[PDB]
Amino acid sequence: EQSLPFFKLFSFADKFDYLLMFVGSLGAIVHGSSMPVFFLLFGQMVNGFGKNQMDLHQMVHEVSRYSLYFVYLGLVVCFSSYAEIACWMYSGERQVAALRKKYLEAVLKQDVGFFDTDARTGDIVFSVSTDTLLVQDAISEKVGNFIHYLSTFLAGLVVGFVSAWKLALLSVAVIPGIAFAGGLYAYTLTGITSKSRESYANAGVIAEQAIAQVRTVYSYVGESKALNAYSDAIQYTLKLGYKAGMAKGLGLGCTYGIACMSWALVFWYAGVFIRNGQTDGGKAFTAIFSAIVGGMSLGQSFSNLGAFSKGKAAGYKLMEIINQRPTIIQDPLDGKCLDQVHGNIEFKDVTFSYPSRPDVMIFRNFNIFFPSGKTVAVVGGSGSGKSTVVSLIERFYDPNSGQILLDGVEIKTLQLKFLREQIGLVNQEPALFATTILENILYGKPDATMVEVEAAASAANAHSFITLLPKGYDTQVGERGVQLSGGQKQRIAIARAMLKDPKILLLDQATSALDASSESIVQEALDRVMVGRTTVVVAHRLCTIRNVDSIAVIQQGQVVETGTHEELIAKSGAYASLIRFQEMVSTRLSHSLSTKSLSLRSGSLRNLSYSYSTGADGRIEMISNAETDRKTRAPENYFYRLLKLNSPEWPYSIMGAVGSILSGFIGPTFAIVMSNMIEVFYYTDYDSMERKTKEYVFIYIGAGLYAVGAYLIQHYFFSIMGENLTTRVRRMMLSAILRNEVGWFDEDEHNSSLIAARLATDAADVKSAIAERISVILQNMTSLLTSFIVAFIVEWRVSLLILGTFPLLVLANFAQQLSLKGFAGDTAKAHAKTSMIAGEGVSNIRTVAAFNAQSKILSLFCHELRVPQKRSLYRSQTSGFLFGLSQLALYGSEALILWYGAHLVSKGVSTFSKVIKVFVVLVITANSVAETVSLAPEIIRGGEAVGSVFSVLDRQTRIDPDDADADPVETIRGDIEFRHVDFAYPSRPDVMVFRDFNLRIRAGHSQALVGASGSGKSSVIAMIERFYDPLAGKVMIDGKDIRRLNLKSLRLKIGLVQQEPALFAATIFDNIAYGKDGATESEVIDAARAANAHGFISGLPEGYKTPVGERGVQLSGGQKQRIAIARAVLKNPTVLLLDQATSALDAESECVLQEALERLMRGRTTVVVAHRLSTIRGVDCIGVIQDGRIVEQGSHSELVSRPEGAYSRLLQLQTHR
Ligand SMILES: Nc1ncnc2c1ncn2[C@@H]1O[C@H](COP(=O)(O)OP(=O)(O)OP(=O)(O)O)[C@@H](O)[C@H]1O
Ligand SMILES: Nc1ncnc2c1ncn2[C@@H]1O[C@H](COP(=O)(O)OP(=O)(O)OP(=O)(O)O)[C@@H](O)[C@H]1O
Ligand SMILES: [Mg+2]
Ligand SMILES: [Mg+2]
Fold first, then answer.
1. Would the CB of 356 count as within 6 Å of ligand 1?
2. If you take atom 23 of ligand 1, which residue's CA is the nearest one?
């Protein structure tokens, strides 16, 4: 959408922020112009240390002077890298933490009708969680990196064009020659990676179907050919992944092969310009290296323009609510204030519709009257808009035509602090703000005294239940410290709505907890608060309204009938149908936020996003998404187990380890040939310098072709090894998911959107954990090792001093690589406790706006943004000082080497080019050792969260489909028998749907398990085949227990017909031959014409070939049912299972079932459940299930012969349509 400029993000800056962005913008320019000044001091040293080869007294006075200028260069990098980190991290905190205080003043003052849960308070909650962390990413510390490397470019050219300006043009013209082939590489690597993501989605839905339809893959045993259709469509991503390793070996060989053919260009013309008497060996070392590392420092300034475009998109969404004008506002002077109220509410000619869609008309000419000191009741039987009345006295909306008089005074002339001070609200599942249970009661009144809080808790049946809690009125209700965790809460709103002492009380449908004798406790507590108050009762069910003096009824836009409950039961006017209807009878925001966090979590950093959940019933819980540190949960032997799985490719690891050592010979050979030409440039024999610099250019060219052939071996191999592992792992993951029990799939984090991406993202990052972390170890440890053997043959007295310094030269190059990604780690973890206070002052704003609790959600937020500011003051002063102090041991220790080397030459021990060769080789080596120790924790710290997918391999199923020590099944005649069995669901173990259940189904009979409004009726077929095991008891089948048999050899002769039949994405020739392996045309045509649909199946364009499940032709609910019966007649089972429930007919003119329900049962033992009391006249036997028991058994001549029982009550519901 629209976007702000890059400025106006700095509009929350006070006068102390214009001082930290000025001291912190001299620290970014002085630290920038220090690497092109290091090349000016190290260049002028070599002129003093190497022109004086004949006078060893002029040497020592000109190396002792320039090695004092490195200690002076250290103190200017120490005190100016301190000033760009300690001043841009703390000034980027104080600006975003005053954006949070004005965005929350803005989102507490908009109208309450703005938040109607229609993905509106799932965007406000997301904009306070993540859009505020994108402004802080953009303006804090990636602005210091923008000024640092831009001024390294501008200072790298001025040092370059002053020393030697001809060599500063040959070294800049080379830079397009390197960035072209280093940028054309990155184009042709995304062109393979994007085709890999495209060629995977053919196999991305075959894994997806077998998880979301797992009950059908088990009943028809085809869990061994959901692998063979998944092991074929991965073989086109393996082969396309072989040529994304060759396009990297040719992309790094031909990028290191042009740079090596460009040091042969700049060091040949330097050898011509010295012989002409124009330069020397220190003005040319300066000019070449200052213009190369200066021009390369524009790839790091422009790397920050990606975060600068996220911080302008996110920052506009926040800045369009901060200055948004609401409608229903407070006027402190243009608003009256009455006294001695009485509570006479009257809607005089009010019409109103919700502003989400003005098409409907809820309140067409609405007219009521609420007396003083009395009780009323507003009741309906459908969506009549009776909860809208209590959502309109609060002024959450406006009546767009009409007026509302309070004691004859219009409420639009009263401000919104006198109206809401006299009205108290109680609503559904009341707001429990995550504080103690003294602070929640003190929202109705802030502080009067202590004894009134106990007095309000006394007359609510609330005093005893907070004294059987071993803490003194101080209990965490948000987190489960001490659990008042009953479904019957104490409705502590009633404790709030008594301490406030309102004159008008707006109750609501407060029977929403499956009411019983437990919920009758607060029923009389409501009868002890509705005294002397003009209260209303919005009643959902009429069973609790039966003692109310006056009741009004609305049906369509207006009131219909009023009066007491004697003429209400009389005359049958629009109330007798409602009492007939009484006889015949959040966790969603977390799914909205995580899918909004989906497709925005592969590009965004893991320390900048969240992951959402439900938590307890106190708040929405936010995990900082850098939980990989606190998890630390992989097996201790995970690195050997991923090598045992990756062994058949042992030739493709030996032939890549003689390609990773040969790449470690290119680095330490560049630093020998380049440090042999510093020596040669100080010759005075201008013909023996020409013929010895032709032989140092030919090495640069000949080893610029060695680099092409030694990165093609390292990266074509180790990609054959690493793409036969992510193919082998994904097959071992799907073959282990489709072996677990059914109840494992029923949980909330095992749905088919977080479990089919673990095979797509968490299974393809095992390549960069055991193949791309060996290639950069064999390479970097044969470069460290070949440069401590050469450098102890040349000279061992200087290189033993560098060996004692070497922990300090690798610690300074380790801090220079953490600074490319910033020193303000995991910034989403400190801003998690502060965000949940805004994350529940928005989703509970219907109770925040009531009680006038708006100035307390803001003072629990300004008083609690002080914790991440003292965490970001101590972290910026420390990390900014330890960075600059470790840059002082990098320049103050290269001045100890070059001084001790100059002392050996003047005593006649060493020579020139024995100190420079030892210096250049052992310093460039130190820049590679601090890359190996940067990936050193992740090898120990369990890989990471994506390399920790062993929980699908190392997991023990409860129901094992295949056993060797199990009896094989040859014939089941059908002997279904249930012994004393009770059962519950593992997803919710409190409900006890079965209680000593018993059946006995003889062979050659049927069964007609009755509806009974869902008394556990579609759970008997879920134990005939083991979708769930019982808690206690035995399931008897063929005179044997069911937990003794080969499960795969039992499910191929028990075939069900699903509740809502689903079809795979294929033709109607596989979906009618998935129930029998090997049938082609012989019994397939006959399997059509048994539940026939033959004109439906011959009337079709390509014969029996059309996609019907996904991305194909659409069928109806009556025709999909016809296909699933064709499976069950092709398979020809012995035990048949049917399942129909909860209005699943979905088609008038019922003929899709009447043909199949009588032909199919002629030789089988069938079990039939149907929710309607029609077409269920199975004349063998019929039983009734109630609360986990059978109550009556016998055919349909001993079932209606009893006068009532329980069956004839259901016979009354036949005429109740
Ligand atoms: N944000 C909204 N947009 C459109 N329609 C709404 C919105 N909120 C509520 N409604 C409608 O208002 C009606 C309110 O019905 P009613 O007053 O009888 O309350 P209820 O359905 O008994 O109880 P509850 O309000 O708890 O569902 C609903 O049928 C619903 O369709
Ligand atoms: N996997 C499950 N998860 C949660 N609750 C279940 C599960 N299976 C059964 N139940 C509970 O047990 C009862 C099952 O009754 P049954 O499924 O036989 O018919 P039904 O519930 O009327 O049909 P439907 O399940 O299609 O609504 C339901 O009320 C449900 O609350
Ligand atoms: Mg509703
Ligand atoms: Mg159900």
1. yes
2. 387
Last residue of a domain, one of 586, 603, 632: 586
Look at the block and give the residue holding tokens 């009391």: 1173
Dig out the tokens for 204 from the structure: 């991305």
Task: Quote the ligand 3 centre to 387 CA distance (angstroms).
Answer: 9
What is the number of the ligand 2 atom nearest to the C-alpha of 988? 4
Cβ of 1018 closer than 6 Å to ligand 2, yes or no, is yes
Question: Which is nearest to 1024 in space by CA: 1137, 874, 1110?
Answer: 1137
What are the φ/ψ torsions at residue 1149 (nearest 5 degrees)?
55, 65
Pairing relationship of beta strands 552-554 and 378-379 according to DSSP bridges: parallel
Element at 120 (helix H, strand E): none
How many Å lie between the centroid of ligand 3 and the Cα of residue 589?
A: 17
Altogether, the residues listed in the chain come to a count of 1217
User: Whose structure tokens read 């049938």?
Assistant: 1079
Angstrom distances, CA of residue 382 to CA of 92, 312, 379, 541? 54, 47, 9, 11
Terminal-to-terminal C-alpha distance of the chain: 52
DSSP string, 471-485: SSS---TTTTSS---
Q: Which residue has the tokens 């790839």?
A: 299
- Is 769 contained in some domain? no
Asked if residue 304 is part of any domain, the answer here is no
**Encoded tokens for 222:** 């085809």
Torsions phi, psi for 469 (to 5 deg):
-145, 120
In angstroms, rounded to a whole number, what is the distance separating the alpha carbons of residues 148 and 83? 12
Residue 1016, domain member (yes or no):
yes
- The CATH number assigned to the domain holding 1057 equals 3.40.50.300
φ, ψ for residue 1000 (rounded to 5)?
-155, 105
Q: Has residue 1072 been placed in a domain?
A: yes
- 311 ligand 1 Cβ < 6 A: no
Any alpha helices (H) in 717-798, and if so which ranges?
A: 720-723, 726-737, 742-745, 767-770, 775-778, 780-783, 791-794
Residue 414 carries which DSSP code? Answer: B
Alpha-carbon span 227 to 225, nearest angstrom: 5
Last residue of a domain, one of 551, 567, 586: 586
Question: Beta partners for 596?
Answer: none
**Residue with the nearest Cα to atom 3 of ligand 1?**
356
Give the domain extent around 1133. Answer: 977-1214
* Ligand nearest to C-alpha 357: 1
| Cα of 1142 from ligand 4 centre, angstroms | 8
Task: Name every residue whose Cβ is closer than 8 Å to that of residue 186 and which is 6 or more positions away in sequence.
Answer: none
Give the ligand at the shortest distance from the Cα of 1169: 2
**In 3-state terms, what secondary structure has residue 999?**
strand
> Total structural domains in the chain?
2
